[PDB]
Amino acid sequence: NLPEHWTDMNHQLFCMVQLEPGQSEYNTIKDKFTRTCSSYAIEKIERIQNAFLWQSYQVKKRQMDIKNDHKNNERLLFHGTDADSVPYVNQHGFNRSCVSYGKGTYFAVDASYSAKDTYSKPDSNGRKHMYVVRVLTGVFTKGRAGLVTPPPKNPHNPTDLFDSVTNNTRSPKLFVVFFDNQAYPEYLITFTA
Template structure:
């Protein structure tokens, strides 16, 4: 990777990997067919994410602590995410409900609202592996996850506990940008 700590690896449109990700994306965004897909490789972020995920799996005594979720953004912020991950320092620039958390949506259609086209009219969206773990109801005033009855913080907060559409995380290592989708 040279001096750069991350890289985007193009995923062939003929591959099973591409078709799987496209199916997830098009399940809520069916009218977008010109999709470029890059797999993100950032070893530093990956190690941080895996260490956090392993801690939560141990705490919860299960391996079912993650979800694939979407995060829409503009091109300028994409570069920050690729290099540094989903930092709270640049979260919330798109009218977030929670002042200091980073938002991830179950639906690509929801995340579409937070994308901005570049000069070629392409939009950017990440498919992200997120440690959602134990979650509770969130609200606009939260700057960190509340405590569980055992004295440890929840891993994420949601917009609707019975049917989450949005997950908000407060820890940098809670999310890994797996894929970057560029589309028209």
């Protein structure tokens, strides 16, 4: 079933819902962004209500919670993208087919890393786009150029994989996931430098 904080979708399966500034949900997401991006200007925040992406994500979450025998497999991370990818992500999520720690989709711990113009490319009017993403990072190891999946947890058990890779395991600043339904885009932040 669809999370409690969602709003009614009149029997539809997809909706982008603008948050009211100063209400609790808006303040919580705004604070995560302004922790490292307080010099920027927030035009709006939208909640992504994608029923199909949510269902597929929650399945993979239940599966990861069984496989790893604990429930700290999920992290809140950031993803900067160009305005032309936004409609695709809203509808179909992150696609690795669209890379120094591997050929997957990249998420940042800090909004400031996602805020770089090379990730959240400014459009004509200077508008920049960053997602807040639920990511199933699960059990992770250091990444390396050319990975197509995470490496195995043991060379003698070649099909038992890590869930994600990172730049640095003691102190991660990015995570790379290699499979379709391992990230759910929860909020879109429209903002300017």
